[PDB]
Design an enzyme around this catalytic site. Sequence first.
Site: not given
Lengths: 405, 405
Positions: A51, A53, A197, A223, A226, A232
Site C-alpha cells: 500500500y 497511497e 488524449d 494509456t 498501445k 496496461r
Amino acid sequence: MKYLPQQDPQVFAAIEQERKRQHAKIELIASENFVSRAVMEAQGSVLTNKYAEGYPGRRYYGGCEYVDIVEELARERAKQLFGAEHANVQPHSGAQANMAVYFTVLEHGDTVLGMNLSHGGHLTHGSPVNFSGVQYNFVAYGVDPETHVIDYDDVREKARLHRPKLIVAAASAYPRIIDFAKFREIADEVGAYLMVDMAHIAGLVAAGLHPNPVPYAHFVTTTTHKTLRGPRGGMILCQEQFAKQIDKAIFPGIQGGPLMHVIAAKAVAFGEALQDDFKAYAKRVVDNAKRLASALQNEGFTLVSGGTDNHLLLVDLRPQQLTGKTAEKVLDEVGITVNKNTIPYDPESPGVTSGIRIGTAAVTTRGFGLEEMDEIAAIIGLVLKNVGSEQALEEARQRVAALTD
Amino acid sequence: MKYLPQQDPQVFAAIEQERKRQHAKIELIASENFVSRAVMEAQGSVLTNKYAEGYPGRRYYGGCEYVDIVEELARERAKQLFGAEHANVQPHSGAQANMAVYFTVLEHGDTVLGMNLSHGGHLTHGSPVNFSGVQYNFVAYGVDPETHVIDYDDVREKARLHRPKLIVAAASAYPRIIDFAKFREIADEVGAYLMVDMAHIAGLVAAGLHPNPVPYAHFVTTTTHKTLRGPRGGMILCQEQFAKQIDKAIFPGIQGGPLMHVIAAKAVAFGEALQDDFKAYAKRVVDNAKRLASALQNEGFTLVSGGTDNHLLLVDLRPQQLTGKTAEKVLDEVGITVNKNTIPYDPESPGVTSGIRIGTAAVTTRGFGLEEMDEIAAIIGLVLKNVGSEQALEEARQRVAALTD
C-alpha cells in the site's frame, strides 16, 4: 511459470491458450501491442503487496522507500520522454487518467468540446452512457465530409458558440496528424483549457514521429499500453502549475492505493522507449502503416482520409457493399483480428458500421515489415472480395499461418 | 526474474530492496498481505496484451475466447465463495468498485449515509476531498463514545432524518463484527439501498468467520487484496436484479478495458480461498488478532472497543500520552510497520491522531502464531514505554530481527 500450473490448472490452461492465440493470429487491432518479458516480470513482482497511497516522500504509509524509487523512475523517465513539467503515473487506466483531469478543472454540468465519437473520438470524450457524457455537457467537432481531416473552423465555431470550459483533442480512430497548435489557439480564443488524449499515438510522440502535444496542452492524458508498448494503465502529463491539483485529483480524488507493480512496469516501458531501438521500432510502425494503406488501395479498398500519417487506418467498406461487422466476422474466420469501426458520416449504426480499423503496432513488434504488409493487404483483398467462397477463406487461412509460422 | 535484471538494473535493484524489506519487517498494517507465487505469475502473464472491453461472450473485440474463460472462472469462483447472485470482477480497485455502485443508484447530489470517517469509515465513504463527498451529499453515523460499537439507533436516526438514497456499511478501522441485518432493517424502513463495503473483512467472510453481507445487501463491494489475500483490485457482488446495471456502470460507465492479467490473478486467489487451508489461515488471523489484543492489554495498552472480533485492532494511546504519529515513527525505527489512525472522538487531527491501527493478516501469512503475538505485544510495550531510550529501541530492533530471521 512454475507455481501457477500446479496451483490452478484451469487458469493456467486458459492462459496457455491465450499465449498460443497471440502467436497464431495476425493482430491488427490498432490499440494492441506485445509487451517485453521485462515489463511482465515487473508486473509479476512482490510490489503488488505494498500500500502506497500518496506520492513519493509524501506517503500515508511507512515502508515506501523503495516503491518511491520505482515511482520516481517512472515519473522522471516520462518527463524525459515527453518533455513534460510534471507526470502522474498512478492512473489505473486511460479512463481514470481522463476522469482525473475532468475532476481537476470541471464542475458537474460544465461544457466540454471533444471530437465527434463517430468521427474518431473516444468513449470517455462524452458518450452519453459513459461518466463523461453523464457528468459533463459534451459538444462535438467533426471532420470534413470529403477529406476526413478535422475541420479546425468547426472546432473554432463550436468553441465560440458553446463556450466550453475544456477542449479535448485526440482520438481512438483518427488516421492523420492532429494540429495541437490550432487546438491551443482556439482554446486561447475562448478561454478554455486544452486537454490532449494521446493514448493511441503516445509511442509515436515519444519517437518524434507525431508532433508533441505537451508544449501546447495544459493536460496530456495517455494509456501506457498501445503504441507506447507498456503495461496496461494510464498517465497524466501537465505543466507545473497544475501538478498539485492533478496529484490531488488522482489521490485522494478518484483513486485509492496505486498499483505499484504496474508502476514498476511503467518505468520499465519508459526505459525501453528512451532507447534508440524503440525509435527505429516506431518508424517501422508508421512505415508499415503507410505501406499497408498503399497496398490496400492497390487491392481496390477506399481508406478514410485517403491514407494515414500514423499507426492506424480505417477502411471504408461501402464500395464493397460490406458492413464492418461482416468484414470483422469473416476476417476472424481466417485468423486476422480487426475491429468493426464507425467511419465519419457512417450510414450504419455503431453495432454494424461501414468500416474496419487496422493498426500496425502489434505486427511490427513481431518483426513484420514492408513485404508482410503487402501480403496482409493481399489476404484481406482475397477474403473481402470472396466472402462466400470457403476455398478462398481456406487459402487465406493458410497464408495467414505462413506469416505467423 | 530473468529479463528485468539485464533490461533495467535500476528498477530491478529497487524491487529487490522491496522484496528484502517485506521479509525483514514486521508488517502490521491492517490492509496488507502477501500473495502467493501463483497469483503473481498470473499478473505477470501475457494477458496484459489483450483488450477485452465488455463481458464474457459479449465483448467489443474478437479473440477473447480464452480471457473469457479466465473472467468466468473469477466470476463463478467469487459466487461460490460468497453465495452472491452476480459478480463483477473488472473493478480496477476498491475505489472504482465503490464508484461504480454509486454511479448505478445515485444521481449527483443525492444523500448517502455512511460510517463517520473518524470512527472507521473509508475515504470513499464521503470524504470532502474524495469524489464521494464532492459528488454526493454524505451524512454520517457514529460509534458509541464508551463501547466504540456502532450505535444502531444513531444509524436509524440519521437515516430517518436525512432520508438517504443509499446507506453504506463497512469500514477501514472497525475492530468488531458489523450487524448487516440491522443495517438492512434500517434501509428497509427508509426505502434506501444498502451497500456493504467488505474490503477489510472479505477473507474472513469467505472463511465463515464474519457474517456474510451478501444476503442482506443490495450491493457488496470489496478489494481482492487485504484479508482475501488476492491481487490488487476491486470486485462487486449483487443480486441478479442489479447485474445488468452494475455491469453497465463498470463498462461503459466508469472504466474502459479491464486488466485481464489481474482478473486471472483474481481467479487464482479465489481458487485459493475456496480451499480448506485458507479457512484454517483465516481462523489463525482472527485467533492471532485476539491473542495480540489480549497481550497488548496485558502490557497496559487500551484498545478501542476493548478488543477485536476480526483481523484488526486500534490502540488508544492517550493513557501513554503519545500520539499515533509519534508511535508510528518510533515503531518504524525498530522495524515494526503500523499506521497512525484516528480513534473515535479523537482530540487530535487526522495528521497526528491518538491511535495506531494493527492487523494480523500479513504476519499470519508468514506463519506467525500465538507465541509470536505475545512477543510482538512485548516489543511494542518495550518501545512505546521507552521512546527516549536508544538501548531499549536497539533491544526491540534485535527482537524484531529474531522474529523475521
